Every structure is written in structure tokens, then in C-alpha cells.
């Protein structure tokens, strides 16, 4: 039984504590049913004690326990943020220790993968400076989970975008469309893409960050999955008004998306076709 291994987590023998964890985390990761058992056998208040834990085989542990909770259902999220997780989450991403900050990071972006309630609070905790400074770390397993934390975030409402845009992290997901490096690349146009899902004010801040003429150079890219990314990016930002509208014309897309309707890619024929059917527009 589950509320027997609860009661195990404040065991003095660590071979006892440590089996009980490993369990809870094991039958956490197999679906909202099981996600649920757990949370129901009280098992929360205990995982989040275990986050201030000194000994790195539980901390390990016990975030991956609460990572797994966090991938759940919008309640079972939500029951991760009354239990106090956030802030020892936030308290994590200044650790030293690159295994417990990425599952810190791992945390924090499944609890922003829920609502607007649940991506609110990750934004109330103080996550986004932290977040947008790692979008400089030389580490690219960070970066890339510091990317996907930013995207969860840009996922939610026009006011939840708004606070990433705030947090300053424009200039860096811009700088990220130079990198030779694919994932990274992907990532950056994924948060980019979701930023501009949002309203005219935040597709112009996009805009206005300078992402067009880098936009405009991916269009010409023989790597047909860049492409793809690249052209769902765009047609978010055609989406907008006509003062929007207007800069993708005058950054030279029209041009690039034209000749993108003659490629051998039928997705990307697609594509390029309903983008500068948006564009041309009126
Ligand atoms: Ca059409």
C-alpha cells in the first residue's frame, strides 16, 4: 500500500526511505490514474520536505517524483503548487549541482505545461529572470531546458506572454535563430512561434526585438525541418494586424515564400502558401 510508503519518508534507516521514494517516483511515472494514488495517499507534503534535503540521492529522487506528479492533469499540477513546491523550485535553479538544476527546471516546466492558473503561479514564484538567464548558459542541456520552461510559459494567455516578454527574454530567444546548433534553433522558434500566438502587442514585440530579418534568412534554408519551424513562426506573426502584416512584407518574405510554393515538400508547399495567403490578406 501507498500511504504506508508516505509514512516511510521520514524513516531514520535511509535503505527504507530511499525504497519507499524510489516506488512513489517509479509509480508516479505511469499515468494520471497512478498520479492521482499517490497524491490521494498524501504523499505531497512529504516529497516537497524532502526538497531542503541536504542528501542528494533524495533531493534527486524527490524531484523526479514531483516532476512526474507535475506531467499530470491541470488539478494534479495545481496540488503540486498548494503543497509550497514552487518555491524551493525557484530556490534550485541556483544550484551549482547541473543534475539537480535541470530536474529543477524539468519541474518547473511541466508545472507551466498546465493552465493559465498553473503558468501564473510559476510566473509569481519569480521563475522568468532565472529563466531568461540561463538562455545565456554555455551548458546546452540547461539552455534547452531553460528554452522549453520559456515556451510553457509563452503558452498561456496574452498576459502570461506578456510577463516572458517583461522578464527581457527577446533578445536572447532572437540571438538563439543564429545558432548552428538545430535543437537550440528549434526550441528558440517554438518559443518565439508561441509568443507570437498571442495578441498584435505581443506579435510586434517579436517584431520589434529584430526576429524578421533572421525569420527571412531561415526561409532559405536547405534543411526542410527548419523550414517547416520557421514557416509556422512566421504565420503566427502574419496572424497579427496590418502594421504587422506590413513588416514581414518589408523584411522581404513575400519574395521568400513565393518561391517556397515550387518546393519538391508538399508540407512545406502548404505551408509557405497558407503564410503569404495570411500576409497578402485584406
Ligand atoms: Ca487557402
Same mark, same amino acid.
Given at each position: 500500500?501507498?500511504?504506508?510508503?508516505?509514512? @516511510?519518508?521520514?524513516?531514520?534507516?535511509?535503505?527504507?526511505?530511499?525504497?519507499?521514494?524510489?516506488?512513489?517516483?517509479? &509509480?508516479?511515472?505511469?499515468?494520471?490514474?497512478?498520479?492521482?494514488?499517490?497524491?490521494?495517499?498524501?504523499?505531497?507534503?512529504?516529497?516537497?520536505?524532502?526538497?531542503?534535503?541536504?542528501?542528494?540521492?533524495?533531493?534527486?529522487?524527490?524531484?523526479?517524483?514531483? *516532476?512526474?506528479?507535475?506531467? !499530470?492533469?491541470?488539478?494534479?499540477?495545481?496540488?503540486? &503548487?498548494?503543497?509550497?513546491?514552487?518555491?524551493?523550485?525557484?530556490?534550485? $535553479? *541556483?544550484?551549482?549541482?547541473?543534475?539537480?538544476?535541470?530536474?529543477?527546471?524539468?519541474?518547473? *516546466?511541466?508545472?507551466?505545461?498546465?493552465?493559465? =492558473?498553473? &503558468?501564473?503561479?510559476?510566473?509569481?514564484?519569480?521563475?522568468?529572470?532565472?529563466?531568461?538567464?540561463?538562455? *545565456?548558459?554555455?551548458? =546546452?542541456?540547461?539552455? @534547452?531546458?531553460? $528554452?522549453?520552461?520559456?515556451?510553457?510559459?509563452?503558452? !498561456?494567455? #496574452?498576459?502570461?506572454?506578456?510577463?516572458?516578454?517583461?522578464? +527581457?527574454?527577446?533578445?536572447?530567444?532572437?540571438?538563439?535563430?543564429?545558432?548552428?546548433?538545430?535543437?537550440?534553433?528549434?526550441?528558440?522558434?517554438?518559443? $518565439?512561434?508561441?509568443?507570437?500566438?498571442?495578441?498584435?502587442?505581443?506579435?510586434?514585440?517579436?517584431?520589434?526585438? !529584430?526576429?524578421?530579418?533572421?525569420?527571412?534568412?531561415?526561409?532559405?534554408?536547405?534543411?526542410?525541418?527548419?523550414?517547416?519551424?520557421?514557416?509556422?513562426?512566421?504565420?503566427?506573426?502574419?496572424?497579427? +494586424? #496590418?502594421?504587422?502584416?506590413?513588416?514581414?512584407?518589408?523584411?522581404?518574405?513575400?519574395?521568400?515564400?513565393?518561391?517556397?510554393?515550387?518546393?519538391?515538400?508538399?508540407?512545406?508547399?502548404?505551408?509557405?502558401?497558407?503564410?503569404?495567403?495570411?500576409?497578402?490578406?485584406?
Amino acid at each position: 500500500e501507498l500511504p504506508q510508503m508516505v509514512q @516511510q519518508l521520514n524513516s531514520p534507516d535511509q535503505q527504507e526511505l530511499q525504497s519507499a521514494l524510489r516506488k512513489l517516483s517509479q &509509480i508516479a511515472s505511469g499515468g494520471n490514474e497512478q498520479i492521482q494514488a499517490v497524491i490521494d495517499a498524501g504523499a505531497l507534503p512529504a516529497l516537497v520536505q524532502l526538497l531542503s534535503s541536504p542528501n542528494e540521492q533524495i533531493l534527486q529522487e524527490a524531484l523526479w517524483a514531483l *516532476s512526474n506528479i507535475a506531467s !499530470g492533469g491541470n488539478e494534479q499540477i495545481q496540488a503540486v &503548487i498548494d503543497a509550497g513546491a514552487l518555491p524551493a523550485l525557484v530556490q534550485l $535553479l *541556483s544550484s551549482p549541482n547541473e543534475q539537480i538544476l535541470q530536474e529543477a527546471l524539468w519541474a518547473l *516546466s511541466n508545472i507551466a505545461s498546465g493552465g493559465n =492558473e498553473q &503558468i501564473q503561479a510559476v510566473i509569481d514564484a519569480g521563475a522568468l529572470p532565472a529563466l531568461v538567464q540561463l538562455l *545565456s548558459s554555455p551548458n =546546452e542541456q540547461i539552455l @534547452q531546458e531553460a $528554452l522549453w520552461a520559456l515556451s510553457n510559459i509563452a503558452s !498561456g494567455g #496574452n498576459e502570461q506572454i506578456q510577463a516572458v516578454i517583461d522578464a +527581457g527574454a527577446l533578445p536572447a530567444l532572437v540571438q538563439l535563430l543564429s545558432s548552428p546548433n538545430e535543437q537550440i534553433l528549434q526550441e528558440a522558434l517554438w518559443a $518565439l512561434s508561441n509568443i507570437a500566438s498571442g495578441g498584435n502587442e505581443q506579435i510586434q514585440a517579436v517584431i520589434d526585438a !529584430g526576429a524578421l530579418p533572421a525569420l527571412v534568412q531561415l526561409l532559405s534554408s536547405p534543411n526542410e525541418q527548419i523550414l517547416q519551424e520557421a514557416l509556422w513562426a512566421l504565420s503566427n506573426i502574419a496572424s497579427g +494586424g #496590418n502594421e504587422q502584416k506590413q513588416a514581414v512584407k518589408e523584411a522581404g518574405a513575400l519574395e521568400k515564400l513565393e518561391q517556397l510554393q515550387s518546393h519538391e515538400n508538399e508540407k512545406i508547399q502548404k505551408e509557405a502558401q497558407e503564410a503569404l495567403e495570411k500576409l497578402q490578406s485584406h
